[PDB]
Amino acid sequence: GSAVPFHGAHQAGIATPVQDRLHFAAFDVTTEDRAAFVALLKEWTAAARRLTAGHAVGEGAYGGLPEAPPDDTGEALGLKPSRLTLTIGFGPSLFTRFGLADLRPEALADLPKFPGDNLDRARSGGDLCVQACADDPQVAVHAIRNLARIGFGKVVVRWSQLGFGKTSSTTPDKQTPRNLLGFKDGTRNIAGTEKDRLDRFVWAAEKDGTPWMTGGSYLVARRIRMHIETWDRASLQEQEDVFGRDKGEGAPVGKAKERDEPFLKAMKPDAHVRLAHPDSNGGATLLRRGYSFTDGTDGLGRLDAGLFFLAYQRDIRTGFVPVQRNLATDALNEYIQHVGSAVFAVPPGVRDADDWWGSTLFG
Amino acid sequence: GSAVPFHGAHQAGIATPVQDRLHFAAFDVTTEDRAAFVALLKEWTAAARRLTAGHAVGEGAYGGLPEAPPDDTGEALGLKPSRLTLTIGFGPSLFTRFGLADLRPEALADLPKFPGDNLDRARSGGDLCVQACADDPQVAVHAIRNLARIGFGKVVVRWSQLGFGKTSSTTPDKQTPRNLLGFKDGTRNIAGTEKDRLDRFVWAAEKDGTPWMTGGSYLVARRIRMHIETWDRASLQEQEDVFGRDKGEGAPVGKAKERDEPFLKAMKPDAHVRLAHPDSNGGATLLRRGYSFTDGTDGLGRLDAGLFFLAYQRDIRTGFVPVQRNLATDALNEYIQHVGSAVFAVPPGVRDADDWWGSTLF
Ligand code: HEM
Ligand code: HEM
């Protein structure tokens, strides 16, 4: 299909079909004035309604007064909506502003330091995020560029990441995508069709303790670099032993098919799948919605490439934290490094044409 | 999703329809052994035949000996060829090695300094380049990665540039793409069907004075930063005056349709199209084939944005040089800065399955 509806009980871009491309941006707030910030949220919501339907923002990209700047910067003219979704989230640091300190959710927990972390503070944190997903990267970039422009004077862009998954024009919808290590990635995940599993593991409930967040979720972002040239010198057996699945079919060891359920005892004790599996973590289960990246080459000639990992969950303390803690001895650690991090509370959806992003928090 | 044929009188990736994604790499050579370098060119050619057909390199991505590394890194398994083209070029610095000094073509000229240039030396130059273009970014990264792996110990990556979306056209029958300033870019180019114009302006000929380059071309690459804060506060009229075309349709000033011919005297004297047009430059004409980029933020609260400009021509001295010199007074200069530069000789095509990249030189 061509467009994804913007309105709902939940924000789109979480349980809705995974699009081919990502532009993720974190913003910092520069105003102290609550009223001015609320005004921005309303203007952003109006723009998002236009963008997700394939229309220009405000009065358009051309045809207005010649002596005024155009309302829309124009680089998406002639393109389709491209299944664009725009998903907003609020960082812990937002809650030190506007008198919000007592409304920070307990489920919006600060992450501990994990072994091997090497976080760049410039590419970590942020007061706000917008996740822009679409099948055409120019559609996603146009959205971020215009939201940043509307917000100028009240917010700045802290850090930005481009990503890619599959190319849907050429690649069947049911084929699992491969990551840049060459392994199928996504086999055992929560799918958007699994209503009950979403209620149990992804959406915040009223009884969880923070009423304004009912129908929202909690997001963890990790920029994870791969040591590509080291990995490529490893033997085939070493690579398969790191994961506990074979590289060609992606079946669990001792099984024949990708979707065969794993027998954890046949994998090495520090294999990634064995450590990450819910049965190893008291039942803890995540929705993964991440994207590959390749940014260029670094000063030594090496490929700057990896996984921009995104996980959604009902509570950070019972989702990402236990699972990542259990990866302390993962065989994969030799070939990766976490170099950026942030956490966000993703509010409930925009109910109808008169609602706006953050209305349950701000009133 | 289809394959583009690899063999021909010319390399693919020039007159070919422009693909959605770019991965460009420049390499420096680290061996002094001519025979070892020739062996690398042959192994690279064999890999390129596989990659452009959607097959894995060497003996494949899996099912070999458990105790050896796979020949192919595996991340393009199950993907279509996706119009992958691989185009190789040789930089001026290459000709200081392997006894090649007297074979350097005259048409491979060093560029002069241009006013406004702020060139980063680390993201400029290179002994050789590979341009990988495809509709799928994973297919393009896979090709560059596997070529670099095969070359370990003989070549190193100097610098690379990814392009997320095209800003050029060799197919006038299809929609012209927009750059990040919001204007159509590629209306008046050279089309892949225009055989006469390609022979006059793009392909090198025997009589030009370097026999080994017959059927090849010359490439200029310029990395250009865009001052999008400054641009986004300009009025609509200011933006249109800079180019000489309207923003919505992309028609020449005063006309109704994109593809109507420009009437240059109705444009401002410093308009980009007026200064760049062949009629303003003694007939000099280019094949433009560039892509947009964004590499994160600038550290000052804004998105970074630019255009990786690529031009092909029969002689650098009669193509890019005169046109860029004429852009000294361009109104666009207020909004852009050139921050990287490289030139390359692009050899002729790989004729058949016994031929190899660079065979006419070596
Ligand atoms: C570059 C980093 C990573 C790579 C390359 C990677 C790769 C993979 C692969 C190939 C699988 C098996 C196929 C599948 O079920 O998806 C897998 C499964 C999984 N990964 Fe990772 N992963 C990475 C990081 C992480 C992180 C940071 C977490 C959580 C903190 C995580 C959690 C999981 C989970 C929960 C599973 C599914 C296990 C199961 O239920 O069978 N992964 N990963
Ligand atoms: C960021 C840099 C640039 C931008 C945004 C830009 C934009 C444009 C636009 C919008 C057009 C009109 C549509 C078309 O015919 O393609 C154009 C035309 C053209 N540009 Fe540029 N351009 C840039 C840099 C350059 C450079 C560096 C050169 C060559 C040195 C160049 C050469 C041309 C030529 C030859 C034309 C066609 C003129 C004609 O025959 O009508 N441009 N450019």
mmCIF file with all atom_site columns, C-alpha atoms in Angstrom, chain B residues 25 193 211 242 274 279 293 315:
data_model
loop_
_atom_site.group_PDB
_atom_site.id
_atom_site.type_symbol
_atom_site.label_atom_id
_atom_site.label_alt_id
_atom_site.label_comp_id
_atom_site.label_asym_id
_atom_site.label_entity_id
_atom_site.label_seq_id
_atom_site.pdbx_PDB_ins_code
_atom_site.Cartn_x
_atom_site.Cartn_y
_atom_site.Cartn_z
_atom_site.occupancy
_atom_site.B_iso_or_equiv
_atom_site.pdbx_formal_charge
_atom_site.auth_seq_id
_atom_site.auth_comp_id
_atom_site.auth_asym_id
_atom_site.auth_atom_id
_atom_site.pdbx_PDB_model_num
ATOM 1 C CA . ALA B 1 25  ? 35.307 4.498  -3.003  1.00 0.00 ? 25  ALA B CA 1
ATOM 2 C CA . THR B 1 193 ? 20.077 7.245  -26.298 1.00 0.00 ? 193 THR B CA 1
ATOM 3 C CA . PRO B 1 211 ? 45.333 5.118  -27.862 1.00 0.00 ? 211 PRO B CA 1
ATOM 4 C CA . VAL B 1 242 ? 19.606 32.112 -8.490  1.00 0.00 ? 242 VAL B CA 1
ATOM 5 C CA . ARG B 1 274 ? 22.805 31.089 -17.837 1.00 0.00 ? 274 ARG B CA 1
ATOM 6 C CA . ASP B 1 279 ? 26.077 28.489 -25.452 1.00 0.00 ? 279 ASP B CA 1
ATOM 7 C CA . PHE B 1 293 ? 24.258 13.112 0.766   1.00 0.00 ? 293 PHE B CA 1
ATOM 8 C CA . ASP B 1 315 ? 38.601 15.947 -22.072 1.00 0.00 ? 315 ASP B CA 1
#
